[PDB]
Design a protein around this ligand. Structure first.
Ligand SMILES: NC(=[NH2+])c1ccc2[nH]c(-c3cccc(-c4ccccc4)c3[O-])cc2c1
Ligand SMILES: [Ca+2]
Ligand SMILES: [Cl-]
Length: 223
């Protein structure tokens, strides 16, 4: 997260770190046995780490659970990143409490102007790499479709939305992919891509979760 602030330990209880010997992507807990992340964060050997703040120090509250299976959306396109969503089923259910809690899926999509909270352990520099130990937060608004399409002509599908600041300075970045974009207590987006990080007129692009709720529900119900 570039231009964000330190969240404060366990203030984002649905945030998870996907780990394979190092942190490579974020994710969101939506119930005690399932996590939602981005399809491009897929790999084998994923250990989901819940209740984290400093990802390099065991401080207490952490729950490390292995993924039993990861379900990449069948229509995921790695060249356009259209349908960049994945569901991860945990080997055992997590113990939910005040430090580990799930986030609700939306019933409707959000409107431009909605203020959301994006979090993650990704890079905090736009020009260079500086990875933090603790979780960073950023409050950012969803942009209108015209501004998004005007910024990325020909690359935005109906399953994506832009959120951020056109002046530059604040954005999600590498290491944040797969993580949550929460607005009014509902998970509206998943960190997907962007051109650089925090550059002027190049806002971040997120997977529009409201378009996948029936898919998530049906897939979980059958797995
Ligand atoms: N400007 C943004 N808002 C933004 C958001 C998420 C991002 N993720 C990345 C990213 C960069 C390099 C590699 C990966 C990557 C690739 C495979 C698996 C996991 C992460 C990224 O997610 C850049 C990147 C940029
Ligand atoms: Ca830790
Ligand atoms: Cl267009």
């Amino acid at each position: 997260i570039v231009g964000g602030y330190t969240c404060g330990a366990n203030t984002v209880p649905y945030q998870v770190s996907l780990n394979s010997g190092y942190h490579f992507c974020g994710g969101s807990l939506i119930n005690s046995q399932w996590v939602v992340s981005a399809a491009h964060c897929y790999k084998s050997g994923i250990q989901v780490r819940l209740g984290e703040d400093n990802i390099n120090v065991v401080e207490g509250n952490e729950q490390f659970i292995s993924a039993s299976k990861s379900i990449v959306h069948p229509s995921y396109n790695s060249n356009t990143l259209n349908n960049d969503i994945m569901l991860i089923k945990l080997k055992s259910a997590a113990s939910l409490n005040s430090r580990v809690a799930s986030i609700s899926l939306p019933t409707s999509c959000a409107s431009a102007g909605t203020q959301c909270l994006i979090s993650g352990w990704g890079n905090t520099k736009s020009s260079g790499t500086s990875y933090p130990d603790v979780l960073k937060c950023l409050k950012a608004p969803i942009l209108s479709d015209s501004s998004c399409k005007s910024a990325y002509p020909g690359q935005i599908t109906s399953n994506m939305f832009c959120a951020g600041y056109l002046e530059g300075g604040k954005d999600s970045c590498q290491g944040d992919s797969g993580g949550p974009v929460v607005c009014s207590g509902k998970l509206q987006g998943i960190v997907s891509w962007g051109s650089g990080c925090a550059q002027k007129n190049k806002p971040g692009v997120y997977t529009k979760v409201c378009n996948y709720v029936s898919w998530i529900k049906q897939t979980i119900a059958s797995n």
